[PDB]
DNA sequence: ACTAATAGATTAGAGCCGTCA
RNA sequence: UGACGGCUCUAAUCUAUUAGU
């Protein structure tokens, strides 16, 4: 018996400085924003991987359709959407040992086998990069589980873009089971697969598909997350910060501040007092030097309530005329609603205000144009809380929705949580594989 | 400014540190992909 | 001044399964 | 690791009290 406020969906930008809503529509209509003259690839693995990859790459150049194109737009062609050259006649290949005496990998000593395989792969890649004259841009790895984690950790020092594709992703036609049916049927989302792989390859080669153009100046975004690690004394260190979202005179930036500040305690998921100052100190100057001025208003996101003394220390650390707000987002809250009539759920963009601070927000509601709903079942809301800080609630409620579509790893219409927490989480498990890394790089290309 | 040919160790070290840190920060921070770097010196 | 046992209320890993009738 | 979502079991600290050597 309460009205629910509806917030209009934000919009994104595309080539020629014009506005749209769905990234796929802009790609199929106007393509990318910036252009790269081409990409030169490089592959590692077995010769079966080579022939399969070449076959798939030549398959990509022709258009493909979907089961129901209204649910997922068709793929018209790689060169059609982008115009960036990518061919199968400029591939370098380094052979791998094929006898494979250690065929017992999946049922043997995990640490030794993982270290040996990752050392072999990384050493071969390093030799190829440091010896061969031919230039390379990316690297695709095909292998026939704590496996993909170590691959990027050691290579992070050498600053080389990387990509991994499962051997069953490309040649799923013959990947049959004991019954004989494919284990991962892809007969309905092949076009969207091409969309995802093409956009990932385009980004990791240095191309920027799209940027936001409905943002306000003098604002900064930040996020924090915590992960579990136990080596000697169970130091719950984590504190792997991410996101900067600064705005210079013109442009968007996604550098972020990285580095595992330590919490030596056991269950104190709340931030340490000594480490708190360094985070904001390392965050401020990165924006300051680019934009020549201090950030008037700043934001802080999290996923766990934090104590008071950290907030105090931030308050003395923060400069004059800067508001600090900690936004807490919760996913597991039972608020199952129901449309009164029909076999059909509620929209997306509906917000419910219960008080001055707390709020319930929806993101997984059906698109008016997709003729269906993103969630398989009836969707569940998310909960937004403002722990500390004074600001306007309505602009915060509308502003989070604007950050629900900057997922570069895929081309879905939107993602439930804001991608800041997603980026922080993704950095977490990949930076903690090796403790010997010092001064990690400040780009998203290498570990995505 | 000008510190004469003396302190030539510092004279080369300051400039080389400046250029090296600039190049390293550009390589490890920016998003655009680059292949070559043309250094211009007066 | 720390060691066991019942609750409320937070809070993090992993593992399956479908892909929109 | 293609990527997203919906689920399914497992664990753990912070309060505030009680029984206890
Ligand atoms: Mg990925």
């Amino acid at each position: 018996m309460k009205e629910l406020i509806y917030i209009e969906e934000p919009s994104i930008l595309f080539a020629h400085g014009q506005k749209c809503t769905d990234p796929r529509d802009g790609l199929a209509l106007f393509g990318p924003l910036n252009q790269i003259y081409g990409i030169k690839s490089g592959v590692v693995g077995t010769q079966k991987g080579l022939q399969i990859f070449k076959s798939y790459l030549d398959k990509i150049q022709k258009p493909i359709y979907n089961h129901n194109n209204i649910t997922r737009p068709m793929f018209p062609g790689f060169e059609a959407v982008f115009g960036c050259k990518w061919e199968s006649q400029n591939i370098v290949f380094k052979e791998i040992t094929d006898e494979e005496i250690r065929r017992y990998l999946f049922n043997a000593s995990t640490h030794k086998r993982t270290y040996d395989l990752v050392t072999l792969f990384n050493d071969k890649i390093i030799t190829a990069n440091k010896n061969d004259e031919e230039r390379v841009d990316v690297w695709f790895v095909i292998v026939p589980a704590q496996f993909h984690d170590q691959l990027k950790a050691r290579l992070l020092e050498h600053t080389i873009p990387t990509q991994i594709l499962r051997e069953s992703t490309l040649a799923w036609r013959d990947f049959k089971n004991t019954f004989g049916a494919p284990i991962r049927d892809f007969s309905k989302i092949e076009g969207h697969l091409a969309w995802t792989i093409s956009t990932a390859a385009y980004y990791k080669a240095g191309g920027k598909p799209w940027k936001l153009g409905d943002i306000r100046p003098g604002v900064c975004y930040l996020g924090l997350v915590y992960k579990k690690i136990e080596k000697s004394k169970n130091p719950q260190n984590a504190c792997c910060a991410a996101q900067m979202f600064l705005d210079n005179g013109d442009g968007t930036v996604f550098k972020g501040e990285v580095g595992p500040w330590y919490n030596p305690e056991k269950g104190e998921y709340h931030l340490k007092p000594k480490e708190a100052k360094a985070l904001l100190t390392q965050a401020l100057e990165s924006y300051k030097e680019q934009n020549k001025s201090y950030p008037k208003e700043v934001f802080i996101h999290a996923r766990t309530r934090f104590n008071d003394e950290e907030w105090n220390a931030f308050n003395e650390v923060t400069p004059k005329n800067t508001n600090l707000v900690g936004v807490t987002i919760t996913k597991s809250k039972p608020l199952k609603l129901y449309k009164t009539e029909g076999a059909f759920p509620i929209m997306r963009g509906n917000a419910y205000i219960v008080d001055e601070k707390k709020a319930f927000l929806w993101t997984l509601g059906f698109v008016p144009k997709l003729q269906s709903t993103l969630s398989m079942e009836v969707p569940n809301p998310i909960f937004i809380e403002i722990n500390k800080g004074e600001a306007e609630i309505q602009q915060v409620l509308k502003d989070i929705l604007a950050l629900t579509k900057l997922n570069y790893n895929a081309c879905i219409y939107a993602d439930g949580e804001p991608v800041t927490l997603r980026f922080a989480n993704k950095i977490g498990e990949i930076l903690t594989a090796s403790t010997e890394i010092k001064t990690p790089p400040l780009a998203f290309k290498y570990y995505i």
Side-chain angles (χ1 to χ4, degrees), chain A:
Chain A
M1 291 55 68
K2 175 63 70 67
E3 291 82 351
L4 308 94
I5 182 161
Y6 183 85
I7 305 295
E8 304 276 2
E9 203 160 349
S11 48
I12 45 172
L13 187 146
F14 290 98
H16 295 89
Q18 62 85 30
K19 204 172 321 303
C20 179
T21 68
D22 197 299
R24 282 170 273 93
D25 277 356
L27 287 201
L29 211 67
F30 293 98
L33 187 138
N34 67 335
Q35 56 87 29
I36 45 170
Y37 316 130
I39 61 167
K40 293 238 202 182
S41 66
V43 194
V44 70
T46 196
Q47 63 84 30
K48 290 172 64 54
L50 271 294
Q51 48 91 8
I52 277 168
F53 172 72
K54 290 172 74 55
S55 56
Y56 198 86
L57 190 44
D58 64 59
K59 175 67 182 298
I60 285 300
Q61 271 68 239
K62 313 304 295 304
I64 45 171
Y65 293 10
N66 289 315
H67 191 175
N68 202 351
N69 284 265
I70 190 63
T71 58
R72 286 135 282 191
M74 81 175 88
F75 182 91
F78 186 95
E79 285 85 317
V81 290
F82 288 112
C84 182
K85 184 82 180 299
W86 180 24
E87 61 276 33
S88 161
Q89 60 158 321
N90 289 312
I91 56 170
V92 298
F93 165 43
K94 265 69 180 161
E95 186 48 72
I96 310 299
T97 179
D98 305 316
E99 48 272 22
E100 195 59 34
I101 298 95
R102 302 168 289 107
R103 55 190 42 76
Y104 42 81
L105 290 195
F106 283 164
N107 290 315
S109 168
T110 78
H111 272 277
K112 290 319 197 287
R113 76 206 189 203
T114 48
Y115 194 91
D116 263 8
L117 272 295
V118 74
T119 309
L120 186 141
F121 265 104
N122 214 57
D123 185 72
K124 206 163 303 285
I125 297 290
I126 287 308
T127 313
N129 167 261
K130 303 223 290 198
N131 295 260
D132 266 7
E133 193 147 339
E134 277 77 4
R135 189 205 61 179
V136 65
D137 274 320
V138 303
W139 296 86
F140 304 155
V141 182
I142 300 94
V143 64
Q146 60 178 1
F147 184 24
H148 60 299
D149 47 355
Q150 313 100 356
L151 266 184
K152 293 102 162 183
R154 294 149 68 128
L155 183 62
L156 176 74
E157 180 263 311
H158 292 276
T159 76
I160 291 302
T162 316
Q163 199 71 359
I164 171 168
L165 284 78
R166 274 305 286 253
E167 91 272 29
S168 51
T169 292
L170 317 184
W172 67 274
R173 303 320 295 254
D174 49 23
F175 271 83
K176 303 318 214 291
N177 72 332
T178 176
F179 205 110
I183 64 158
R184 324 171 51 161
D185 181 23
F186 269 42
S187 56
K188 326 287 182 63
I189 52 175
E190 58 279 18
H192 197 76
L193 180 163
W195 279 113
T196 49
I197 280 177
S198 172
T199 187
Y202 182 56
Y203 184 32
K204 268 145 178 172
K208 325 194 303 306
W210 65 78
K211 79 191 185 77
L212 294 174
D214 302 339
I215 62 170
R216 54 214 303 279
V219 67
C220 176
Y221 292 162
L222 186 63
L224 294 91
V225 70
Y226 296 121
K227 297 297 294 177
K228 182 71 68 68
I229 171 170
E230 65 276 16
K231 47 169 197 287
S232 48
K233 51 203 169 300
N234 207 19
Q236 182 41 66
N237 49 15
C239 183
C240 189
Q243 181 58 259
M244 185 64 72
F245 214 80
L246 66 86
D247 310 309
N248 193 359
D250 183 358
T252 187
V253 175
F254 262 70
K255 38 166 70 176
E257 295 317 310
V258 176
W261 288 296
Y262 265 60
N263 189 325
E265 276 76 5
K266 167 64 192 41
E268 188 190 21
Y269 272 80
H270 304 229
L271 187 55
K272 294 308 293 169
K274 178 168 71 175
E275 314 297 330
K277 299 155 270 291
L279 160 64
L280 188 58
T281 303
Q282 191 192 338
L284 195 72
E285 76 286 42
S286 300
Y287 164 77
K288 176 258 174 187
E289 60 89 18
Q290 285 194 359
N291 212 7
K292 203 66 181 66
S293 67
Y294 283 0
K296 195 44 71 189
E297 298 323 302
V298 309
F299 265 46
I300 295 91
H301 291 60
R303 67 141 184 75
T304 296
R305 47 165 51 74
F306 44 79
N307 63 66
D308 197 4
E309 51 92 15
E310 317 167 16
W311 208 237
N312 304 122
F314 277 126
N315 283 308
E316 292 90 7
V317 162
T318 190
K320 173 256 291 179
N321 280 348
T322 62
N323 305 326
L324 321 179
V325 57
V327 186
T328 299
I329 295 91
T330 300
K331 202 188 200 293
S332 302
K333 303 286 288 303
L335 199 43
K336 193 68 62 65
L337 275 183
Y338 290 96
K339 181 67 68 68
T340 297
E341 68 276 9
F344 189 72
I346 199 176
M347 294 177 70
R348 91 186 276 272
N350 278 325
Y352 171 37
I353 279 175
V354 295
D355 75 326
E356 192 41 59
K357 304 314 178 78
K358 300 177 190 175
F360 279 104
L361 192 51
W362 297 75
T363 52
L364 300 176
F366 64 92
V367 181
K369 80 176 293 179
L370 267 295
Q371 300 306 78
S372 278
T373 315
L374 289 155
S375 160
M376 185 180 288
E377 302 288 327
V378 292
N380 45 6
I382 69 160
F383 182 93
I384 309 307
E385 194 264 0
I386 294 191
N387 261 329
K388 272 85 73 177
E390 209 279 321
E392 319 283 315
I393 183 65
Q394 176 70 91
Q395 48 88 11
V396 164
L397 299 182
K398 71 181 288 184
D399 214 5
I400 174 175
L401 193 43
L403 279 73
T404 59
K405 291 175 192 181
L406 265 54
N407 175 287
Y408 281 122
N409 216 37
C411 283
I412 318 291
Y413 188 46
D415 182 272
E417 73 204 5
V419 294
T420 291
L421 159 67
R422 176 84 40 79
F423 289 165
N425 184 22
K426 199 67 176 176
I427 301 183
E429 73 259 5
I430 208 64
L431 188 136
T432 182
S434 170
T435 67
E436 308 85 319
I437 289 312
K438 160 73 149 39
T439 62
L442 288 90
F444 268 91
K445 288 197 276 293
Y446 311 89
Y447 63 89
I448 286 177

